Chain length 167, copies 6
């Protein structure tokens, strides 16, 4: 793990970058208790300034309930982009889009983009720079010109260390 | 205790945050003599600038006299908020309120919040970011989305090391 | 390998300099898969500012297809100078030329050069400062007054360490 | 003594604070020779700029003669406050008072305060933040909400190390 | 050699100084191949800015031919001063003169001075601050109030390390 | 030799201070050859700025000859303040006086005071801050309130190392 941690320092230095996460809930212990704090910690470090142009993408696989998490995050303070335009289906162009920004006083439209994998039918216009996989084997968005980082963990507190959120 | 000192460097980096403390004095040695100088150092470090917007909350548990400590702190040079309009009852909305700040010259309305637990019945609109429990086991404000640091100590100088007030 | 990395710290500090690379792909593992990312990282570290005034040259010996790699680089978001005007032939004066630069907002006409070695017959008027040779023994552009660094590698990732792109080995 | 040195790192970081020293000279060797240099160094390091609002106080217990020390300090180039108006008696509000200051060009009214403990009867408006005691057992100004630092030394060269005036022992 | 490197840190700290070199090529291996690069790097380090007022002097003893070296250095990009007006013999006041400088945009008249010791007759107006001798025993410019640096080398890769050109 | 170097680190930091040197050359090896270079280095480090406003004094003890060294220093590019008006006897007020200084462009009237001990009959109005003694036991300018550093050396480079002019 300490071998992996410093490998990632170059990836996470850039201010403007496109990052995807794919996660599987079942094989992580105490997931529903720590996910919210995990996201709240990532955002403040990596998505709290003007130069941080693009928010990150979180994809959860399996049969899971997004509404509850979205409400809990709204109570915590954060706003999310899901991609729906009123119905039960997801739209790619609305999911991937640029937010409004105001330099002074600082205002932001949304800080993260959330979804499920099964619903996202298709691919983006611009391939991702970094694809992170946590306990998933392979995904359709793998390519030779894209950097794939793949891990296996037993608790979420382990990943924060890798990503430099704690000591 | 050494690793925990390094464990908390990230939490105390942010300037503006809502921090809560709970203390039980019966099981701490030499409390009455050292509490004032603990509070004074914490305030002079983490709540003595303009960007430091939310003052901290100190909750004491047990049967205890706040008035004497409040007078001692006034003599030392600090001003406190207690949430009391004449009467014994504690108005919650008047204890979770923002103070007046002036950049030049620097002046503040109050520097700390002080209360008793049993007197404070209810809850806040915004949940606390960090909840420190010193010598206490359970509380009503614990939740999944709040960070909780529970400790057990025999003296205050031990806590000074953890919170970076002192070199040793 | 570790001392080689530090032997080069002084060469690569300067902002403006003329750098040439020669490569043989027949004897490298996973070349087709790692090449684009090699180029992208090098460019991002040494070709993304106003002070950086000379883009680099990459020459590939053998029988190889440049067009596909060019399309892939375009998809990745980078532009290349090849030195051709319609036809098959290559022009030295149109491959060794200065690019347009706009300071605010930053724009650059092109970020790298490309070619095949056999097609490029001739030479430049100003001789290269640094001529990296990766797995090739001898060339026609070597001289007493040019700095020459020859290496032997088995996979591309080692050069990342040698040249400070990724610290971990 | 290496243990005590870094304990005082935070206390001496601030620019504006109120410090008090109590000393006993009967049990220190070669006192009259080095007292003046001690004061001069302390003053140069902690009392020589605009942001240093409060000058420090030196109290001596015993049967000492202050006139000679005052004359020697004037020859060395320093001005002191003693807290007297013609007479023998000592006044408190003159001794604990703020001085004139001019930022540009920098000038100060007085740089230190001196006295004998017995003549000074009473207390101040504001209790002191730091009370150093050197070879002295008990004082009336000791209080729970005041920081007290008690030491035992055979020479004055050691206290300079403790207080971070000179490099090493 | 690890001893000498840091000994010279103080001499090479100042920006404006008068530095002299004396060299013997007979007992150095692979000399003609590496001289030009040595001069190039020294110049790039110590004679590229407005504060570097006085360029340095290189003297060669023996039966060497200077014309070829001057041509190679011209091709490399450096203009040299040789102290001759007409061609037969040397003139000291032309050799030891001050150049033109423009602060913005930077242009300089010449970067280095070059000569043969047998041809140079006499002494300067101001004595040298630092005199370097490489495989030479005695010289007439040795005085008590002048710093001397006598060395022995079998290659020129060593002197670069001594002078902090490479590590 | 090493810790002694660190003892003097605090003394040499101040920009403006009055400094005196007393030297005996009979017992030093290779004095004439190295004195000038010692002086030149000391001046370049400690007496070549605007804020450096109190040039140092050197006093040489014995039957030495100043004129030659003074000429050597003029050749090397430095000016000195001897203190004579008529080349017979020294005057204190003329040897202990302030120099002219122009900030832009930088120019200085003189950079050092040079003298012999026997000729300087008297004392200054302001006592020296730092008195360095090299191979002399006792002096008439020693006092309780004046710092005295006394050494014994065999070559000048040792003192150079002590005073931080050369690494080693």
């Amino acid at each position: 793990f300490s071998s992996l941690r410093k490998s990632l320092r170059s990836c996470l230095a850039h201010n403007s970058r496109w990052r995807v996460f794919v996660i599987n809930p079942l094989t992580i212990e105490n997931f529903d208790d720590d996910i919210v704090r995990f996201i709240k910690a990532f955002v403040q470090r990596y998505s709290s300034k003007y130069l941080h142009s693009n928010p990150p993408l979180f994809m959860l696989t399996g049969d899971y309930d997004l509404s509850v998490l979205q409400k809990r995050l709204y109570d915590a303070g954060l706003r999310c982009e899901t991609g729906k335009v009123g119905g039960t289906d997801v739209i790619i162009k609305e999911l991937f889009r640029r937010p409004i920004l105001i330099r002074n006083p600082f205002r932001m439209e949304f800080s993260l983009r959330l979804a499920k994998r099964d619903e996202v039918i298709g691919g983006p216009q611009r391939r991702p720079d970094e694809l992170f996989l946590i306990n998933v084997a392979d995904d359709e968005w793998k390519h030779e010109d894209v950097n794939v980082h793949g891990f296996k963990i037993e608790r979420l507190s382990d990943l924060e260390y890798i990503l430099q959120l704690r000591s």
